[PDB]
């Protein structure tokens with residue numbers, strides 16, 4: 001049962017990422033797993049509950065991933081570079097995660113439970129970036145500048161570049177996004193020195 | 194005429210898509226709001242995707258006309274750039290609604306080639322307008338020398354990311370904060386010292 005739910009969520013996430021939440025029907029999820037629509041309904045009374053529980057799950061996976069990746073890193077510049085690297089829409093899992101987040105931005109403007117979940121996840125991320133900046137400022141590697149405003153700018157820049165990648169802007173690519181962000185950190189965050 | 198019927202359908206459909214979400218709008222919603230039948234709507238737009246596509250085409254043209262009217266008497270590049278950025282704010286009403294729709298387009302683009310092409314052409318024009326404005330300011334000596342293309346990439350991405358924060362309701366975000374943040378970026382990263 002914890003298992004059944006798990007399979008539904010993993011399958012729903014992928015379908016939502018690749019086909020679009022509103023284009024995914026409950027039979028599409030059943031067909032993808034071999035169950036029936038009634039089973040799916042038993043665990044999730046509505047389509048929205050699937051999205052919401054899938055999202056909850058994903059936010060957890062992503063924060064785990066981030067802890068694993070940053071756990072040994074003490075140098076704030078390296079930490080920030082790695083934080084930024086985790087946000088790239090690389091082929092496979094991360095690109096799929098971006099696809100779903102793009103939809104959640106829209107669904108947030110309409111659904112309060114989704115908006116709440118989105119804002120809590122974003123705030124956690126945002127505080128992380130700010131904390132990291134402040135650390136680098138205390139270590140002397142980062143320029144003394146309001147961390148909150150800088151975190152706001154970097155977060156916003158990450159989101160905008162992601163969109164340009166996902167939508168196919170000419171000359172855009174994950175690598176160019178990476179370079180652009182690394183240049184932002186080296187030239188706007190790092191202490192010229 | 195019949196140019197009239199088309200127009201009205203598209204103005205209505207745009208507003209509904211913005212406030213309710215594309216996938217939540219039905220043909221009957223549009224018909225009810227205008228007092229026609231579904232058959233008239235279908236005649237002009239065989240499918241819902243055609244409505245979205247044609248509504249987007251129309252909005253892209255309106256928005257560019259709005260831009261020319263606002264900028265045509267402005268020769269100072271700094272003032273032009275400030276006004277250009279002002280037109281991108283999600284201010285109450287039509288501009289907010291347009292953001293609503295563009296957020297949906299970002300997702301729909303990852304799935305529909307015609308919407309993707311239209312979005313890329315419209316983005317490209319805006320991007321070139323930004324780069325051109327930067328280059329004029331450089332020639333006038335009011336903007337710092339820097340790659341206008343990288344700067345146009347950065348500015349455009351920043352705008353998009355800040356808009357998402359406004360629309361999604363990030364704590365402390367408001368159209369006023371976004372304006373201030375973007376004007377601070379221009380004065381400190383674009384304007385010459």
Ligand SMILES: [Br-]
Pocket residue numbers: 324325328329
């Ligand atoms: Br030019």
